């Protein structure tokens, strides 16, 4: 299960044929947390650290919560 959040996080970044991806994971569904995935998500990723920073910025504002960023990703 730790494996699926990782792949959810990797792909949530690669985006930003997509409308299919949200539904699949939306269905598949049915702090220290994010720290644990930092290296795996961004491995060899160009500019990974700034990307991971945007991600944690949005996780900050929306005070399971990674899904709402995907609806906010799909705002544009």
């Amino acid at each position, epitope marked *: 299960f730790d494996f699926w959040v990782r792949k959810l996080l990797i792909d949530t970044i690669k985006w930003e044929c997509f409308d299919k991806w949200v539904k699949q994971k939306e269905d598949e569904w049915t702090n220290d947390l994010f*720290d*644990s995935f*930092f*290296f*795996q998500v961004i*491995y060899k990723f*160009n500019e990974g*650290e*700034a990307k991971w*920073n945007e991600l944690k910025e949005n996780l900050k504002k929306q005070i399971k919560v990674l899904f709402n960023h995907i609806k906010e990703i799909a705002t544009i």
Partner: antibody
Amino acid sequence: EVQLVESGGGLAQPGGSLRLSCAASGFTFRDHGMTWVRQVSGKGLEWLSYITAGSKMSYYSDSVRGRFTISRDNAKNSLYLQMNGLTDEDSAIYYCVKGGGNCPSDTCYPSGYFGLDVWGQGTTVTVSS
Amino acid sequence: SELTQPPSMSVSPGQTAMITCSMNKYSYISWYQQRPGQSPALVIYQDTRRPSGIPERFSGSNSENTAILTITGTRDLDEADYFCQGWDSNVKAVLFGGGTKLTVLG
């Protein structure tokens, strides 16, 4: 509790070679990445190299590339730096440092995200004729 | 790709010290303090977080390509060298700043 103890420092000749070792204790040596940092007396910090937990990745500074080689043995809680081609700009205190954070599947690097969270007392290397 | 720090900075006791560290492209930034005759110690990581044991006077931030170590209520024992530290993804290498000798007046 956590202890990084360096040895193998001392005197070397210009062009010669040295090998430092680090005995680690106080924590799970295999779970975490490892790194060497050096400091000339009265000057700044210079990062040298970093080795992943399963030894499969290695990063280096361009100042020690193809002259220094990092390595580790997880059986003996040990970290190694082989230095060849020593110059006088290599005389400094050499620190053995624990990478912060975790290391899954050899993906860790010395990031500002966790930083380097435990430093040793260091060992002095002198390169002289 | 360089982390740029002021070599020296002075502060009156109890005043607020702010060491800056400017960069070209974003990196996360850790901060180390070196007291006379001792190894560095990690004081701020992840731009803004402090390890257990670091007094709540020490705080950090990173915006617009400048990171700030902030010490509020500077004491005598805050006299040290302070180093920022980041990463260069495009050559895979640690960045260190030159260091900042913090002097506490009086």
